[PDB]
Design a protein around this ligand. Structure first.
Ligand SMILES: N[C@@H]1[C@@H](O)[C@H](O)[C@@H](CO[C@@H]2O[C@H](CO)[C@@H](O)[C@H](O)[C@H]2N)O[C@H]1O
Ligand SMILES: [Cl-]
Lengths: 214, 220
């Protein structure tokens, strides 16, 4: 097996910056049978580079590949906001036609604070024994954020889950949903439900709350 | 117009089998090596198998030798993966993937999720995330739909039958401790539209043949 090792594992660069993605092989890859793919979250990979340096159909000039032997690169000469992805190299010289582990490229932008919104459980859901409380953080950067749920001012742990959207292809922000899940019995023993958000763009943390049943 | 269309995936019992098909159009299929590549949830791409243009040479990852078989039908421009003795290690999105020498960006299929599990398809409950003063300022309101307790992936969510697209964020599903998935989809709209425009989320869970339309009504 030819092992392909990609570096860096993660890369964050701004529009206009030059991005370099490396692919090292454990033995020589002959015939420059080395490809690069772009994969966006939850989407089919697109072939970008084949034969080490050839652009695939529909690939813009800012993407280029180079290399031979054991060392290859994929360059984005001038980043555009639509260029975030995981980039994978693959050799197709000798089976198994192995992939590298990918480099996740994020598009850096200037700090952008989230808008925070809290949504009580719907009447319909409470009917059936469970309460989901949703806290939405909209359109922010960087991706790192801390959401703390408080119930009657007591810090919660273990009863929430979070999910984050892919980067916006035009303005490079993210959005995040946090869902607190309780039994209806537990839900009805408390009054104040609060989501407290800490983020680099907020000079001070922002708390959104409601009182149950109002 | 290059298209690779996969079928044959979905939920399958551990120890069971699936037959994956891939119908190719838009380039000379019979000139190229073809492959299957898979991606386990949250993981990287993994090459599975490939086949020469005439079928006469094929290679496999060791973990599937003797239980997966790659074949092709050049007459029907189709690629196949017959998968047997399936295990949870096989759970992944499977892509048919042309030899990169073809040089076409759009040379992989859309992917089919294979979930190796003894759980049953189960359709979501859909609850509104109603707009209110808490989701509304600066002339815009946020609203949405909580799509809760379904298995397996995936679901699709649209708004107003696809008429509403701007300002939509449909979150990646989270797997709950229950072993069921949940997801929210949210949209930001003009607060002035709340009296006037109807907002409906259209949820399709193909694995359970469940379709739900939920109207999301404003709070005072
Ligand atoms: N073990 C190899 C297999 O896994 C490779 O993908 C394959 C690719 O080389 C191919 O060469 C033919 C002709 O020589 C060319 O038309 C294809 O497009 C190449 N990708 O080689 C096997 O030996
Ligand atoms: Cl691989």
């Amino acid at each position: 097996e030819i092992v392909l090792t990609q570096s860096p594992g993660t890369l964050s660069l701004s529009p206009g910056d030059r991005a370099t993605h490396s692919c090292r092989a454990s033995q020589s890859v002959s015939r420059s049978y080395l490809a690069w793919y772009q994969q966006k979250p939850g989407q089919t990979p697109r072939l970008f580079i084949y034969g080490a340096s050839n652009r695939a159909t529909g690939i813009p000039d800012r993407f280029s590949g180079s290399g031979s032997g054991t060392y290859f690169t994929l360059t984005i000469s001038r980043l555009e906001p639509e260029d975030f992805a995981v980039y994978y190299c693959q050799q197709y010289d000798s089976a198994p036609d192995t992939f590298g582990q990918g480099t996740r490229l994020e598009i850096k932008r200037t700090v952008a604070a989230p808008s925070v919104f809290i949504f009580p459980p719907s009447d319909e859901q409470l009917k059936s024994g469970t309460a989901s409380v949703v806290c939405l953080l909209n359109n922010f950067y960087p991706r790192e954020a801390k959401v703390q749920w408080k119930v009657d001012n007591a810090l919660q742990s273990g009863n929430s889950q979070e999910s984050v959207t892919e980067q916006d292809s035009k303005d490079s922000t993210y959005s995040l949903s946090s869902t607190l899940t309780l039994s209806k019995a537990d839900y009805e023993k408390h009054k104040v439900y609060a989501c407290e958000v800490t983020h680099q763009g907020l000079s001070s943390p922002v708390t959104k709350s409601f009182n149950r049943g109002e | 117009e290059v298209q690779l269309v996969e079928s044959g995936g979905g939920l399958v019992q551990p120890g069971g089998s699936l037959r994956l098909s891939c119908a190719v159009s838009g380039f000379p299929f019979s000139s190229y090596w073809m492959s299957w590549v898979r991606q386990a949830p949250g993981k990287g791409l993994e090459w599975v198998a490939n086949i020469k243009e005439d079928g006469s040479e094929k290679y496999y990852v060791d973990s599937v030798k003797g239980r997966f078989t790659i074949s092709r039908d050049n007459a029907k421009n189709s690629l196949y993966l017959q998968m047997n003795s399936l295990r949870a290690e096989d759970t992944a999105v499977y892509y048919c993937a042309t030899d990169p020498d073809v040089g076409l960006s759009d040379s992989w299929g859309q992917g089919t999720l294979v979930t190796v599990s003894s759980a049953s398809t189960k359709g979501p409950s859909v609850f509104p995330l109603a707009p209110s003063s808490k989701s509304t300022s600066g002339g815009t309101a946020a609203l949405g739909c909580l799509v809760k307790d379904y298995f397996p992936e995936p679901v699709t969510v649209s708004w107003n039958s696809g008429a509403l697209t701007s300002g939509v964020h449909t979150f990646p599903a989270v797997l709950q401790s229950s072993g069921l998935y949940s997801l929210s989809s949210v949209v930001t709209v003009p607060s002035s539209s709340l009296g006037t425009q109807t907002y409906i989320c259209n949820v399709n869970h193909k694995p359970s043949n469940t379709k739900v339309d939920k109207k999301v009504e404003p709070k005072s």
